[model samples]
Target: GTDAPTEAALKAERTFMAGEKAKPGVKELADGILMTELTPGTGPKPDANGRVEVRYVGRLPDGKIFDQSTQPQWFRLDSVISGWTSALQNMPTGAKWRLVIPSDQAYGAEGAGDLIDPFTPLVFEIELIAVSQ
Candidate 1:
């Protein structure tokens, strides 16, 4: 029989190891950013205007989170940050995905108001709870 997955294995899928410790060939789309796959799902897909209900937490590259859904809120894909839309469009319903978003795709060099800073890459753990019209 196959051996049960170890804690280290499970942790590997969830943790973003530092650059020097990260896996080889895992390209960083932006500076100081990294991501690892968590739960892979199979279901509906979303496009440019696709809308869905999602649960997510936004964090800084240094592991500081600033915001999250109040409770799986519904939103249009086109209405959120560019990075979010790009990441979500690649997911299917019931999929739980993690992202290491660069500031350029998020709030950009200037950032969004006071919640984020300029040129700060962020990390996000998001779950595609539902897909709707």
Candidate 2:
């Protein structure tokens, strides 16, 4: 059993994404996603189907800390949320970015229990540590 998002929550998510994308440095990507480069990486960008190492701090609107990584973590570039998949594919080792993942690119209406909610977007500050094919 799970609770569904209210109309207010869905509207709030839309508003939040709209407002955040307007901030300086935030750039729009495909699939309604957005990114802000926190640190530039002149290194290599990970290709799809490649493995990437990163440290991530993920949050919801209003300061809800959903997840945070204390050490480097490896994940398949093609296997993460569509938002992460699309953005991290453009991220390079040694770079850090703040990603704004819309629900269409994340959990969508299904929602991840205990943390992510339906129709809610997510924000992630990810540090790319390495890439392996």
Candidate 3:
């Protein structure tokens, strides 16, 4: 059985949704994920097969950090979570973005371990450091 989202998570979701209305650079994906580029990158964007290096911080909607990397980590686009795969496909080297991933595109109803809850949305701050085909 999946656990319900905490009040803090729900509150954060509401706040994020409300703030999105006034955000100018927010872009919506077909799968309902939202992204806002904090710093636009120069150079070609990565494709599905591209390998990327990035520094990232993963957090719950309520500003709680679940995970983060102090140094860049390499990932093959297709090998990561759906949200990351999709986000990386459009990201260029040196790009920094704030990604809002819906549950379906993230860990889904089952969520991850104790860090994430069922149906909980997540926020990520990601910086693409490098990309290679």
Candidate 4:
């Protein structure tokens, strides 16, 4: 059996995130990718397997609302889109940020269902409000 975040990879990823934090915001930190960690959470960080409740407003770069949480709906972190799962795994309860997701990390080359088109990058203002064990 293999443990997740293998020892070598974990160290490398930490170093990479540190480097990302150090670089200037205008430059592409990783091949046209830029992430600004606004409001770093001092609270409990959610695990990759943890279930959470989030309130979000998602849109395209042009600012069109493609999806929302319906105000009162709670979704399991393991059951949503791949981009969402990946993004949430980096967040902690009460953490909020503006996430800029490339099409590859988002709907991808094929895009989302009927509503979204191919190769469309997405913007999300997401607030990770709570987590349910």
Backbone clash count for every predicted candidate, in the order shown: 0, 0, 0, 0
Question: Against the unseen true structure, what C-alpha lDDT does each candidate score?
Answer: 0.69, 0.87, 0.81, 0.63
TM-score of each: 0.73, 0.92, 0.84, 0.66
Model 1: lDDT equals: 0.69
Report the C-alpha lDDT of model 1 over 1-133, residue by residue, as the tens digit.
2322445432432353344237654434433344455787798978769897889998876678888888988989899887777667667888886777655577765666666655556778888888776
Candidate 1, residue 51: lDDT? 93
| Candidate with the larger lDDT of 1 and 2 | 2
Give all candidate RMSDs, comma-separated: 11.8, 1.7, 3.2, 10.9
Report the error of model 3 at residue 5, Å.
8.1
TM-score of 2: 0.92
Model 4 Cα RMSD, Å? 10.9
Q: Taking the tens digit of each residue's C-alpha lDDT, what string does model 4 give over 24-110? A: 652233323445555566566566566777788888766899887766446776776666667676677777766666656666656
TM accuracy, model 4? 0.66
- Model 2 Cα shift for residue 112 (angstroms): 0.9
- Error at 117, model 4, angstroms: 0.5
Candidate 3 lDDT (Cα, whole model)? 0.81
Clashing pairs in 1: none
By summed lDDT, the worst window of 10 consecutive residues in model 4 runs over 26-35
lDDT, candidate 3, residue 11?
68
Best by lDDT: 2
